[PDB]
Design a protein around this ligand. Sequence first.
Ligand code: HEM
Ligand code: HEM
Ligand SMILES: N[C@@H](CCC(=O)N[C@@H](CS)C(=O)NCC(=O)O)C(=O)O
Ligand SMILES: N[C@@H](CCC(=O)N[C@@H](CS)C(=O)NCC(=O)O)C(=O)O
Ligand SMILES: [Cl-]
Ligand SMILES: [Cl-]
Lengths: 274, 274
Amino acid sequence: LQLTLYQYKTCPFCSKVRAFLDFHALPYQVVEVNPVLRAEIKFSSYRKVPILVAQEGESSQQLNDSSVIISALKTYLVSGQPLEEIITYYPAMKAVNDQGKEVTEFGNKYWLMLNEKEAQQVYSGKEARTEEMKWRQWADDWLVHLISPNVYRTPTEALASFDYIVREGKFGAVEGAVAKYMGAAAMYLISKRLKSRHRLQDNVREDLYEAADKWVAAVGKDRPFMGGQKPNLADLAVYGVLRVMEGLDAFDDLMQHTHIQPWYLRVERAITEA
Amino acid sequence: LQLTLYQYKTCPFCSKVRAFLDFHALPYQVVEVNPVLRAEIKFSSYRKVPILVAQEGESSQQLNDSSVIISALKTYLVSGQPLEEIITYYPAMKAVNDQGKEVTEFGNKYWLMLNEKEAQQVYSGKEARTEEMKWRQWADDWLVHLISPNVYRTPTEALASFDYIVREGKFGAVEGAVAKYMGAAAMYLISKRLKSRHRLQDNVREDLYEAADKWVAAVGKDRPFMGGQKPNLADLAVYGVLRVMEGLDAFDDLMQHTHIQPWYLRVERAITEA
Ligand code: HEM
Ligand code: HEM
Ligand SMILES: N[C@@H](CCC(=O)N[C@@H](CS)C(=O)NCC(=O)O)C(=O)O
Ligand SMILES: N[C@@H](CCC(=O)N[C@@H](CS)C(=O)NCC(=O)O)C(=O)O
Ligand SMILES: [Cl-]
Ligand SMILES: [Cl-]
């Protein structure tokens, strides 16, 4: 079972997949995608990264949405059911936007295709299962929208972030130097629109802190992670989403004003412990 | 198990719920919602119809999306699992539109929460299960978008349709006479935009006929319905969606130019046979 992950390292959707693979000690290779030319992805009719192709010797299936990848792989790890059949339970649902745009959403994306035995094996608590589902969705429908406006809220942070983008990702020597400044400028302005369009407070940091408190509160003081003893897909989701900011001002702020660090480090070490 | 269905009779989403309840001979009461004032719905924080509240003596849960209602009730009929727990597996997923609008989608909406035994009892064929899921989604992400532009493509049909709307539904004597003309006018013009926005051919009828052929072809000549022996959620979905046009020109056209009538009548009589 060989796994190749096409990604943008500092992109939350990819950080999520990595968090999951890292925690389930699954071996995988990563091919960094050039965000400008995206050549390493020209082979996939699915135009968004991350994309992960799994290979079983001769067989090979392409898993697309980041949450779908995680769900497919996860149910795979517990049910053993052939992966070529599992991605079938996460159908790509095309539909024309109310604005006339073709959009694809993946059905059942946050639901592990498990049977009674299997479920009990990973949740042991019917409500615990619908819970990660709810927070998994929360992670990328709310938490991620707090990143850009936060890591690009100031021209300095903007440059810091895009610098961290060019260094980390795959940019030619030239498309990098340029991209840092054009990029930070673009993103600084664009994040302004995102700040607005997503109904964020004027003080973007406060939406981040609140989100964090909401999460720690949800985790509660009766358990290490939402997954209880060990982290479940929800812990990995929030963590995966938040990590992308490691090294940036927003992250230190987040850590210094929210009581979320203990949970965060707990997941980080739960992961490093392969 | 008392069921109350709040609806707009001629509305496809409601026609779908009725097709399902009708087929599973489930007793239910319907309270027609006044599309203008919507007073009979003022009690629900969920602002779309259909809505169906189920009551078990003292207990009572509100099922919201039309497909969610069908999926909840259906898994309920086969698993016997308490309905208050089942609606839990169809979480309401809020998210801010790319246009900045708060939108709610229901997770797992096309998936019956069944275990191995149960599934074999209703599908007997792993692929047969993912199949209705695919067509269920097809029914309301494509088929329904063919209705308005078809039953409102002409000022005459427009009036015919809205006449059938005021008569059928709940409109005061006055808000009815007015609504027929204001309504038909509005819908005639609005359907034009829908025709465009949804990428329909200029000859709106052709999109309908093609959709129908696609469906009959899908069903094939080796089985009465997609559900095979009896209809499954997919047959009820397409049927439920198409019925809304019964009595209108588009429906007769649909019936006279597509080879879909035999399947249609099969579902209709399958239903009348309580
Ligand atoms: C190369 C490094 C990249 C990074 C670090 C990055 C980072 C992010 C982040 C943090 C978000 C969430 C912020 C928000 O939605 O307000 C986001 C969203 C998004 N990104 Fe990227 N991105 C990258 C490249 C790209 C590229 C090249 C494209 C276009 C081809 C792209 C398209 C999008 C889209 C469409 C969304 C919104 C997805 C959704 O609605 O959930 N991103 N990206
Ligand atoms: C009273 C009788 C009504 C009937 C017969 C009716 C019929 C329909 C039909 C046939 C469609 C699908 C056509 C298309 O999407 O192009 C539709 C969609 C829709 N209707 Fe109604 N409708 C009614 C009332 C209303 C009212 C009062 C509202 C607003 C409060 C409403 C809001 C919508 C919306 C938002 C959609 C699109 C849903 C989606 O994206 O799947 N409808 N309606
Ligand atoms: N919901 C998707 C997100 C896909 C996405 O937005 N990916 C971006 C990179 S951050 C992309 O490749 N952009 C292509 C596009 O949106 O056209 C997932 O979880 O994988
Ligand atoms: N996808 C929903 C459709 C809900 C819907 O569009 N309902 C319309 C009537 S056709 C409504 O009540 N409109 C409220 C709104 O969209 O604001 C379902 O299957 O129940
Ligand atoms: Cl592209
Ligand atoms: Cl309203």
